[PDB]
């Protein structure tokens, strides 16, 4: 018996660069699944929203209010510290937790069986940097990361993938998540006086751009300082409606990465649909995953109701009166076997719960235009062609295949600057001079 309406969850912080694009995109796909009668099936899929102020407390307390409400799924957290704890209350209520902005390389494991990840695993950027570094041959990197659950799990991977190529991370500098403009200066001064100039930065996007506004005004970004940035930096730009060309002057040589997505007419009509909406045009490509995840619910919601006649619940100071979701691991099992093609190309999940084709569009920032100096893929790694071409090929592992365009490093140089710089710390260079008696 197909009911009147089904309720899914939505945990995403409204007051950030991801959520202000996510909230129309979830509202957009909700309007299309109630317009598409092939997936409607007499059911009005309304989506209960539940914001959070990016804190671990009221994220869970809002989601416990979602679990007191009846749900069948929950469009997951993107904060990735909420996504640990909610994937303990979704590991005991058997509710599938489909994240769109997780990017945490420990959530795809067997201790979290109900945490499916629609975005690409952050485990692959730390390969794509560890393919980018041994491409240029720098081999000694000093990392900078916010000390959240996303940093300490992220740069622990890059410590390990660089160990296979005999590279290493020298000094895991770590900003505190509540950071003013003083704790950034106390740290970025203390890493100028060290042995490397290849900075990986992996910071949350809202306070992420305030790292470079300290690095410019400290004299760091100059000749001989390679800045590599992960996905937050294009999300810090593309969430702004137009690049204001002062922040672009801060970013002169920083080799950022970005989630590559193959184009189609479905994504093309969505971009014109996005121009029809205008939430100040903060199109930052996480809304492209947030528009995907509602379809990935709804198409899996469609297939599950051709088998099951009806969803089923139960009943279990403030007591534990939360309604558990009976018969959920069957509904979780059909979502892993999905072969849907959303707006971001094909969707498939292998045994490691990753999405099947991770591809990163490298980009350089040298002028006022971000030009894409290559494409990283899981398949080949560092092409210059669009990485959908090589997917039918055999995996070609050649040194002539790992190839990139002209890269402009900071200081307006274009030869790859040497990483090592001798430190100015309390140790002096102990030159050992012999004490000659003959032939002085």
Ligand X SMILES: N[C@@H](CCC(=O)N[C@@H](CS)C(=O)NCC(=O)O)C(=O)O
Ligand Y SMILES: *[C@H]1O[C@H](CO)[C@@H](O)[C@H](O)[C@H]1NC(C)=O
Ligand Z SMILES: *[C@@H]1O[C@H](CO)[C@@H](O[C@@H]2O[C@H](CO)[C@@H](O)[C@H](O)[C@H]2NC(C)=O)[C@H](O)[C@H]1NC(C)=O
User: Which residues of this chain interact with its own copies, rule CB under 8 A?
Assistant: 55-58, 60-61, 64-65, 68-69, 81, 84-85, 88-89, 91-92, 106, 109-111, 147-148, 152-153, 156, 159-160, 163, 168-170, 172, 176-178, 317-318, 320
Q: Which residue, 202 or 379, is less far from ligand X as judged by CB?
A: 202
Q: Which residue, 93 or 150, is less far from ligand X as judged by CB?
A: 150
Residue with the two structure tokens 């100071």: 317
117: contact with ligand X by CB under 6 A:
no
Q: Which residue, 58 or 194, is less far from ligand X as judged by CB?
A: 58
Q: Which residue, 80 or 357, is less far from ligand Z as judged by CB?
A: 357
Minimum Å gap between C-beta 214 and ligand X is 17
Is 286 within 8 Å of 101 (Cβ atoms)?
yes
80: contact with ligand X by CB under 6 A:
yes
Helix, strand, or coil (residue 175): strand
CA neighbor of 289 nearest in space, from 358, 243, 337: 358
Query: For 11, phi and psi rounded to 5 degrees?
Result: -110, 100
Minimum Å gap between C-beta 346 and ligand Y is 7
Token code pair at residue 182: 């003083």
Rg of the chain (C-alpha set): 24
Minimum Å gap between C-beta 424 and ligand Z is 42
Minimum Å gap between C-beta 331 and its own copies is 20
356: contact with ligand Z by CB under 6 A:
yes
Q: Which residue, 106 or 378, is less far from ligand Z as judged by CB?
A: 378
Integer Cα distance of 336 and 53 in angstroms:
31
Q: How far apart are the first and last CA of the chain?
A: 101
Task: Return the H-helix or E-strand segment holding 364.
Answer: strand 364-365
- Out of 25, 45, 72, 79, name the contact with ligand X by CB under 6 A: 79
CA neighbor of 158 nearest in space, from 177, 175, 144, 137: 144
Minimum Å gap between C-beta 302 and ligand X is 29
Residue with the two structure tokens 């505190």: 176
- Out of 87, 284, 378, 380, name the contact with ligand Z by CB under 6 A: 378
Minimum Å gap between C-beta 90 and its own copies is 9
Minimum Å gap between C-beta 244 and ligand X is 20
Token code pair at residue 321: 């009166």
Integer Cα distance of 216 and 412 in angstroms:
14
Cβ atoms < 10 Å from Cβ of 320: 8
Cα–chain center distance at 131: 18
Minimum Å gap between C-beta 43 and ligand X is 31
Q: Which residue, 85 or 222, is less far from its own copies as judged by CB?
A: 85
50: contact with ligand X by CB under 6 A:
no
Q: Which residue, 153 or 235, is less far from its own copies as judged by CB?
A: 153
* Binding positions for ligand X, 169-228, rule CB under 6 A: 202, 204-206
Give the count of alpha carbons within 13 A of 190, CB side only. 12
351: which DSSP letter?
Answer: T
Kindly list the distances between the CA atom of residue 378 and the CA atoms of 128, 241, 389, in Å, as whole numbers in the listed order: 9, 31, 13
Minimum Å gap between C-beta 64 and ligand X is 19
Binding site for ligand Y (CB under 6 A): 15, 53-55, 339
| Candidates 56-64, 165-173, 348-356, 361-369; binding stretch for ligand Z (CB under 6 A) | 348-356
List CB contacts of 433: < 8 A, sequence separation 6 or more. none
Q: Left if phi > 0, otherwise alpha if psi is -120 to 50, otherwise beta: which for 54? A: left
The item of ligand X, its own copies, ligand Z, none sharing an interface with residue 80, based on CB under 5 to 8 Å by kind, is ligand X
The item of ligand Z, ligand Y, ligand X, none sharing an interface with residue 55, based on CB under 5 to 8 Å by kind, is ligand Y
Cβ atoms < 10 Å from Cβ of 150: 26
Q: Output the CA torsion sign for 263, 358, 108, 21.
A: negative
Helix, strand, or coil (residue 325): strand
| Candidates 106-114, 166-174, 238-246, 350-358; binding stretch for ligand Z (CB under 6 A) | 350-358
Bridge partners of residue 375, in order along the sequence: 383
Q: Which residue, 43 or 290, is less far from ligand X as judged by CB?
A: 290
Helix, strand, or coil (residue 298): helix
- Out of 210, 354, 372, 401, name the contact with ligand Z by CB under 6 A: 354
Minimum Å gap between C-beta 41 and ligand X is 34
> What are the residues binding ligand Z (CB under 6 A)?
350, 354, 356, 378
């Amino acid at each position: 018996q197909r009911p009147s309406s089904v309720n899914v969850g939505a945990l995403f912080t409204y007051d950030s660069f991801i959520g202000r694009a996510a909230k129309p995109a979830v509202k957009a796909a909700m309007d299309d699944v109630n317009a598409d009668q092939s997936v409607l099936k007499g059911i009005k899929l309304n989506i209960i929203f539940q914001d959070s102020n990016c804190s671990g407390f009221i994220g869970t307390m809002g989601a416990l209010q979602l679990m007191e409400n009846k749900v069948v799924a929950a469009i997951g957290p993107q904060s990735s510290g909420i996504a640990h704890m909610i994937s303990y209350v979704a590991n005991e209520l058997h509710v599938p937790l489909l994240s769109f902005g997780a990017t945490d390389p420990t959530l795809s494991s067997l201790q979290f069986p109900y945490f499916l990840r629609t975005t690409q695993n952050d485990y692959f950027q730390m390969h794509a940097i560890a393919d980018f570094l041994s491409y240029s041959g720098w081999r000694q990197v000093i990392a900078i990361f916010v000390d959240d659950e996303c940093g300490r799990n992220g740069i622990s991977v890059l410590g390990d993938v660089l160990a296979k190529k005999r590279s290493r991370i020298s000094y895991k500098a770590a900003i505190t998540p509540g950071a003013d403009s003083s704790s950034i200066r106390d740290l970025l001064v203390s890493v100028n006086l060290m042995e490397s100039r290849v900075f990986v930065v992996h910071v949350n996007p809202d306070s992420g751009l305030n790292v470079f506004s300290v690095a410019k005004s400290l004299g760091m970004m100059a000749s001989g300082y390679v800045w590599i940035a992960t996905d937050w930096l294009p999300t810090a730009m593309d969430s702004m409606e137009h690049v204001d060309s002062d922040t672009m002057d801060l970013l002169q040589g920083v080799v950022a990465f970005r989630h590559y997505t193959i184009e189609s007419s479905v994504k093309r009509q969505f971009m014109a649909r996005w121009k029809n909406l205008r939430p100040n045009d903060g199109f930052n490509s996480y809304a492209m995953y947030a528009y995907d995840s509602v379809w990935l619910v709804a198409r899996a919601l469609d297939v599950f109701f051709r088998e099951n006649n009806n969803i089923t619940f139960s009943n279990d100071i403030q007591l534990s009166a939360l309604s558990v979701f009976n018969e959920g691991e069957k509904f979780m099992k059909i979502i892993l076997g999905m072969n849907h093609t959303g707006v971001t190309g094909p969707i498939q999940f292998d045994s490691d719960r990753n999405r099947v084709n991770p591809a990163y569009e490298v980009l350089n920032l040298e002028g006022t235009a971000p030009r894409t100096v290559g494409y990283w893929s899981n398949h080949s790694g560092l092409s210059v062609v669009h990485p959908e071409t090589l997917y039918s090929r055999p995996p070609n592992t050649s040194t002539a295949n790992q190839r990139l365009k002209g890269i402009i490093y900071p200081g307006e140089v274009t030869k790859p600057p040497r990483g090592w710089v001798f430190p100015n710390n309390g140790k002096p260079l102990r030159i050992g001079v012999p004490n000659r008696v003959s032939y002085t």
